[PDB]
Design a binder for this molecule. Structure first.
Ligand SMILES: O=C1N=NC(=O)c2cc(OCc3cccc(Br)c3)ccc21
Lengths: 198, 195
């Protein structure tokens, strides 16, 4: 069920595809980034074609679309990371067990930002030895969310008398969400890698 | 693609089905337990019919069968748990974020029911009832674990992203397996028993 606009991968399971400025695909990601990161400049944007991560993510999306009934369950969010983590994330996606404690913790999970400006902080997108910073653009199954708390290892129950029926994600603020935390594998697909510099 | 031996769920996606004693499915699961736990009393065995967990597990199985270029990635293993964790596991399966973790920070599965039957794992409830899962685990290609692992090690440190599927206490004669990812383990049966 691989998307028809992906490059042919020749029975291979992984490929990074360099995008061309002037194409709508490149320009919409550039605009989404520059909305809050006008001071930085983009070196390049790569489409991540990971067949296995895509399959698992799409199975979780279809399950959450069934479970939630007519919710927009998916948001396009940002995740800054260090150069050392980029090969693992490209192949294996986002592992909560590898996640750094956030300066404002709303739970022990993987953090995704609404604003590129947040992920552009040196604390998340650490400049490598050549001054390159790295930010993923990520399909995240935010589903139905509530304000998190520092102690969470899973999203909280919607109802305390039904502890197993969980929120899909948590946020910093349900009125004005600026970040989302997810606690399960295959709940985020890294779709694009932005390489950028000051 | 819901298995043959599952019974009708009336268009629902989750059911716990009590097995009939004396029929093949019950007898098969009873014998796997009684191989090392003949001194315990089985109160009941339930088949876990969780369509979402099953689907995510079968996708991983298909992926691991392609990656390893053969089948034989699956083992039937035991997991003891406290009564309060049973509803979570039935619905969401096994969560590494939730005892000793000497071979890594993953979910632990025993080759022998007798290991899972220890009170430290299958903690007796108020009434003395103990709980153990029979689990389909995608052990795949495994190596020896060690303390502090958050994922299995690489097969070759010249390709750090190509990983073993699981780790064990002992590669020649394993008695436990640790997996580090959601949906590498399907809880298939729950055994309620006493000492
Ligand atoms: O069935 C289980 N249910 N919950 C567990 O945490 C568990 C853990 C487990 O190995 C833990 C361990 C660690 C180091 C040395 C030795 Br020896 C054993 C085996 C079975 C189980």
């Amino acid at each position: 069920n691989l998307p028809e606009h992906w490059t042919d991968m020749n029975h291979q399971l992984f490929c990074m595809v360099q995008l061309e400025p002037g194409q709508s695909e490149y320009n919409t990601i550039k605009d989404k980034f520059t909305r809050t990161c006008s001071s930085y400049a983009i070196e390049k944007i790569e489409r991540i074609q990971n067949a296995f991560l895509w399959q698992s993510y799409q199975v979780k999306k279809r399950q959450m679309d069934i479970k939630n009934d007519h919710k927009n369950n998916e948001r396009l969010l940002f995740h800054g990371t260090d150069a050392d983590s980029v090969p693992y994330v490209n192949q294996h996606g986002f592992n909560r067990s590898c996640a750094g404690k956030n300066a404002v913790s709303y739970g022990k999970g993987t953090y995704f930002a609404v604003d590129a400006s947040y992920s552009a902080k040196d604390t998340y997108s650490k400049p490598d030895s050549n001054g390159r910073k790295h930010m993923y653009v990520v399909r995240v199954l935010t589903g139905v969310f509530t304000k998190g708390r520092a102690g969470l290892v899973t999203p909280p129950p919607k109802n305390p008398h039904n502890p197993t029926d969980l929120f899909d994600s948590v946020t910093n603020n349900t009125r004005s969400p600026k970040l989302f935390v997810v606690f399960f594998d295959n709940q985020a697909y890294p779709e694009y890698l932005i390489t950028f510099t000051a």
